[PDB]
Design a protein around this ligand. Structure first.
Ligand SMILES: COc1ccc(Nc2ncc(CN3CCN(S(C)(=O)=O)CC3)cc2-c2nc(C)nc(N)n2)cn1
Length: 834
């Protein structure tokens, strides 16, 4: 109907890509994927409890850490409950279920966290609600309101010849290449591929490079048609010449219906700007009028069916015992495959084991599926995310192998999904087909949970906007999601897209008026911001990086354009919630010109490090602020309240010179403390903050930073910013940081001795997750950071995390690192000036 068509116009606007479109396809896969996702969509929409879905109790089921236990008033917490305005505080024990606390009060209505769309409902103890764990973390009082539970009717949705019996060698005709606009010899290269593994390869003869080049030649491969494994790609590449890769493109050999690929294809190609997610894509270049294209012929009803010695033991164990960046040699691979069944008893052998399979060999693949048919130990094992992630990366392309990882993901609690969601979304870039267990998993987990679903939207939306390589796929996943989240959430997303689009318009305009930063330009900002205040910016919108917060009208006076050379918008909003117990504005930086996905990744890895540290009862008070990529080169950043940079603290005392002074920071910290209890706690928070950032930035290899890119709160919380962008330094430990701790150049201190004692505990704790961090780091680089995609860059983290080396020796490596920051002093900061 037409009702279905205005709604399609709406979905398209929410995604920021026209799904129904067919200008950039060469088959029906994306359309097949839309239909195939209807079932998982509906099966989740129908089965989800409408009551718990409307209130999304953000609950964890982890042990409440040792650091938050011994910060309690004897198994009792104070919850302040609010009627109209006035309130009654109630004593409550960590085990008191929410519905039972209502009985404790009444001596149906629901509890909603004052100021937020966050509910304390369902059958979990209150110590298992993240909001509560946050209040304790930041030593604060749990304020809640007696509210009427939201109507689940708002969540309602608008109801809508066998291949193995073929011994032919694989051939492909290269008709030629056409380039609209342009002397050096050119050739086409053709690969049969599975993952990264090039199974078989063929070049053509080099011809003179002109607007059109024709070959009309058959390329016979040595691989047989029956040996082609599902997921196999034809990778066509074009070099010229000591040569250079110019354009590349890919084609699935076995399509989504299990059929061998036949007929004519006129594929549009991508240009090189090297492990890249993009280099694996089944998508062809949309830019018809500017791009190179290859023309090919396939002629081969062909569908695929659906079917020890002590030293060796030691050699095998040592192979299982290595990191995921250690290259397996031929001896290793031949050993793993032979001792296949021993290797299946060890969950950690799996990544290595399935990297030992020869996929260009039908009967070996068959044997591998028999091996998966008998995977009892894997199916029973206690889930490791690091092992699971390893099997969803680029090294694996077999749908069944990848499906054993997704299987393990099914058992993740919703809280743990949010922790890994970003990388899981990125992991979709390694799936051969648009419809996969993983896609379905994300699809349903987002549909089951309003929070996961919120972030899924922005994660996918972000990729759709700044990746031609995967927009089509993600777009199909997002449409499938939005068709299930419900009119309630669809309307939230709408307002949010409305706001960021309006803001971008203002940003683009203001950027043009500048060159440094004027003050009359700020008047033109405040001008156009008022122009939007009535028509037609919606009263209130959810904050993309913090979906609990509803932001209302702008604080126009407080809005400015930043001193940066990409002119970000410093913005502040009223909180739209009348029940909000404060008057603090919501501070958002709105930035155009940088692709923020990179900052997203680092900050997410930072949250992972936190949760890792929670398992070891540590807490290092990092500030991984909100950061959402919302469009093509636009996003928003959470402004951390009461925070100034290190550089500005120097730029104010010493002056705009550069002759830095040690004392300045401690004095700065003292001028901001009401008591000595509030100064030492502030110094204490600096002891962790700094130690947290020191460790983390060193492992990630982003430690060496300009001191204007490090900020501090007035409560002692140090934190790095702007992960967007000669002799070296590991991290940033300056004589002013060391002053706060006590040291004066070459001494020790009551706190400094604790600094190293917290750093090492932190460094070694991350080291217990070497595998996970390695795979996170690599996926970060492969899917999010194309500027640094060499093997040299990934092998940094092997050195940084000191693989193989035992604990005590690695401790000494880290202690040496701190003792390089002592040696270097200020020669780091100083050198940036010119
Ligand atoms: C990835 O892009 C960005 C951009 C900005 C930030 N954050 C900040 N960047 C710079 C500053 C320093 N700033 C200089 C300009 N002046 S001015 C006169 O133009 O208003 C304000 C202070 C601060 C931040 C920043 N970042 C966060 C996350 N919080 C806070 N409080 N501050 C992080 N990432």
């Amino acid at each position: 109907s037409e009702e279905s068509q205005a709604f399609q116009r709406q979905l398209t606007a929410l995604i920021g890509y026209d799904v129904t479109d067919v200008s950039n396809v060469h088959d029906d896969e994306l359309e097949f994927t839309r239909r195939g996702l209807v079932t998982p969509r509906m099966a989740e929409v129908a089965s989800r409890d409408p009551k718990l879905y409307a209130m999304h109790p953000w609950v964890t089921s982890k042990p409440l850490p040792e650091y938050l236990w011994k910060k309690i008033a004897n198994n009792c917490i104070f919850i302040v409950i609010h009627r109209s305005t006035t309130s009654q505080t109630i004593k409550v024990s960590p085990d008191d279920t929410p519905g039972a606390i209502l009985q404790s009060f009444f001596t149906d209505f629901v509890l909603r966290v004052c100021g937020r769309d966050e509910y304390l409902v369902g059958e979990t103890p209150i110590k298992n609600f993240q909001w509560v764990r946050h209040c304790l973390k930041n030593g604060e009082e749990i304020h809640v309101v007696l509210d009427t539970p939201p109507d689940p009717a708002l969540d309602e949705v608008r109801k809508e010849v066998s291949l193995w019996d073929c011994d032919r060698k694989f051939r492909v005709k290269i008709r030629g290449i056409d380039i609209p606009v342009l002397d050096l010899t050119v050739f086409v290269e053709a690969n049969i591929q599975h993952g990264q593994q090039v199974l078989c390869q063929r070049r053509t003869s080099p011809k003179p490079f002109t607007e059109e080049v024709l070959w009309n030649v058959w390329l016979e491969f040595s691989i047989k048609i029956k040996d082609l494994p599902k997921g196999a790609l034809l990778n066509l590449q074009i070099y010229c010449g000591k040569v250079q890769l110019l354009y590349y493109v890919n084609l699935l050999l076995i399509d989504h219906r299990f059929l061998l690929r036949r007929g004519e294809y006129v594929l549009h190609m991508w240009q090189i700007s090297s492990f890249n997610a993009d280099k694996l894509t089944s998508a062809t270049n949309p830019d018809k009028e500017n791009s190179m294209s290859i023309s090919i012929l396939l002629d081969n009803p062909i569908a695929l069916p659906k079917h020890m010695p002590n030293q060796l033991r030691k050699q095998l164990e040592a192979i299982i015992a290595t990191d995921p960046l250690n290259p397996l040699t031929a001896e290793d691979k031949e050993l793993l495959w032979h001792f296949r069944y021993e290797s299946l008893k060890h969950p950690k052998a799996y990544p290595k084991l399935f990297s030992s399979v020869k996929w260009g060999q039908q009967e070996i693949v068959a044997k591998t599926y028999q091996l998966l048919a008998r995977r009892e130990v894997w199916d029973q094992s206690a889930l490791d995310v690091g092992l699971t992630m390893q099997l969803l990366d680029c090294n694996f392309s077999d749908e069944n192998v990848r499906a054993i990882a997704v299987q393990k993901l099914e058992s993740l609690e919703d809280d743990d999904v949010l922790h890994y969601l970003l990388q899981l979304v990125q992991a979709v870039k390694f799936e051969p087909y648009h419809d996969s267990a993983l896609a379905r998993f994300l699809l349903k987990r987002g549909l089951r949970n309003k929070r996961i679903g919120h972030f899924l939207f922005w994660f996918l939306r972000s990729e759709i906007a700044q990746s031609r390589h995967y927009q089509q796929r993600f777009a199909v996943i997002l449409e499938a999601y939005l068709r299930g989240c419900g009119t309630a959430m669809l309307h939230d997303f709408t307002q949010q897209v409305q706001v960021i689009e309006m803001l971008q318009k203002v940003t683009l305009d203001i950027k043009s008026l500048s060159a440094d930063v004027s003050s009359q330009v700020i008047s033109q900002l405040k001008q156009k911001l008022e122009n939007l205040q009535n028509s037609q910016l919606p009263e209130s919108f959810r904050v993309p990086y913090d979906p609990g917060l509803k932001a209302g009208a702008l604080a126009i006076e407080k809005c400015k354009v930043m001193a940066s050379k990409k002119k970000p918008l410093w913005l502040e909003f009223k909180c739209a919630d009348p029940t909000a117990l404060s008057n603090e504005t919501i501070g958002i930086i709105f930035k155009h010109g940088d692709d923020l996905r990179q900052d997203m990744l680092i900050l997410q890895i930072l949250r992972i490090m936190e949760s890792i540290w929670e398992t070891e009862s540590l807490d290092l008070c990092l500030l991984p602020y909100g950061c959402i990529s919302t469009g093509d080169k636009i996003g928003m950043i959470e402004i951390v309240k009461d925070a100034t940079t290190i550089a500005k603290i120097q730029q104010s005392t010493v002056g705009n010179t550069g002759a830095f002074k040690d004392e300045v920071l401690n004095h700065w910290l003292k001028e901001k403390s009401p008591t000595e209890e509030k100064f030492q706690a502030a110094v204490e928070r600096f002891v962790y903050s700094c130690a947290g950032y020191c460790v983390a930035t060193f492992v990630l290899g982003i430690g060496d930073r300009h001191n204007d890119n490090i900020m501090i709160t007035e409560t002692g919380n140090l934190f790095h910013i702007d992960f967007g962008h000669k002799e070296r330094v590991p991290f940033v430990l300056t004589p002013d940081f060391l002053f706060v701790m006590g040291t004066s150049g070459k001494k020790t201190s009551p706190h400094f001795q604790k600094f190293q004692d917290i750093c090492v505990k932190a460094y070694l704790a991350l080291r217990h997750h070497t595998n996970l961090l390695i795979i996170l780091f690599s996926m970060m680089l492969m899917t999010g950071m194309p500027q640094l995609t060499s093997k040299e860059d990934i092998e940094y983290i092997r050195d940084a995390l000191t693989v193989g080396k035992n604990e005590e020796d690695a401790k000494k490596y880290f202690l040496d690192q701190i003792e390089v920051c002592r040696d270097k002093g200020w020669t780091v900061q100083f050198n940036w000036f010119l």
